[PDB]
Design a protein around this ligand. Structure first.
Ligand SMILES: Nc1ncnc2c1ncn2[C@H]1C[C@H](O)[C@@H](COP(=O)(O)OP(=O)(O)OC[C@H]2O[C@H](O)[C@H](O)[C@@H]2O)O1
Length: 172
């Protein structure tokens, strides 16, 4: 388990790879895979839909059960559910949907959830459907997370731009 390979080390605890998070999860067998969720755990597009499809929809049936028992999450919050065939656990984290004007400062609260886990495979929270700048999401990740985070960025052009922007920001 946790057989991460081919990552670029950005900090002593943050690693980044140009890869699809589902294919990584099947390669790596992580203890925790992170899902970029909404508060109802309705897995639409993005990482949530990719993860859910790879579980043959088991993720969504789990999520419906969870919500029926517990109610929706709060923005910036999380819950640990099963990782099904992809990981031991899936950490569902809700970033702010800036497209809806939710507080971007909740992106820090969202990444803080990662600090409850030794090692995790994760996407860049709020950087897709939720409209945050991916460079910002990387910045908050690096500044907030102290545990070992392996970031999967599937789009090569975004990956190249994120690395370039990280170098500029680190050197100042
Ligand atoms: N297969 C893949 N492997 C690796 N990276 C991937 C990927 N697919 C997409 N990305 C990238 C794009 C983007 O850079 C980041 C997060 O994008 P995102 O998944 O849209 O998450 P958000 O927090 O912005 O929106 C949350 C809302 O959409 C969700 O469906 C959920 O239901 C909620 O309603 O990961």
């Amino acid at each position: 388990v946790n057989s991460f390979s081919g990552y670029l080390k950005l900090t002593d605890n943050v690693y980044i790879k140009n890869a699809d998070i589902v294919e990584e999860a099947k390669k790596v067998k992580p203890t925790v895979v992170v899902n970029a969720a909404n508060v109802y755990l309705k897995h639409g597009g993005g990482v949530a839909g990719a993860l859910n499809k790879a579980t043959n929809n088991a993720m969504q049936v789990e999520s419906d059960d969870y919500i029926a028992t517990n109610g929706p999450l709060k923005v910036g919050g999380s819950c640990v559910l099963s990782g099904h065939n992809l990981a031991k656990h899936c950490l569902h984290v809700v970033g702010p949907n800036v497209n809806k004007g939710e507080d971007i400062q909740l992106l820090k609260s969202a990444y803080e959830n990662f600090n409850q886990h030794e090692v995790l495979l994760a996407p860049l929270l709020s950087a897709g459907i939720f409209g945050a700048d991916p460079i910002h999401s990387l910045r908050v990740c690096v500044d907030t997370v102290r545990t070992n985070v392996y970031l999967a960025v599937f789009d090569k052009n975004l990956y190249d731009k994120l690395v370039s922007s990280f170098l500029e920001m680190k050197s100042e």
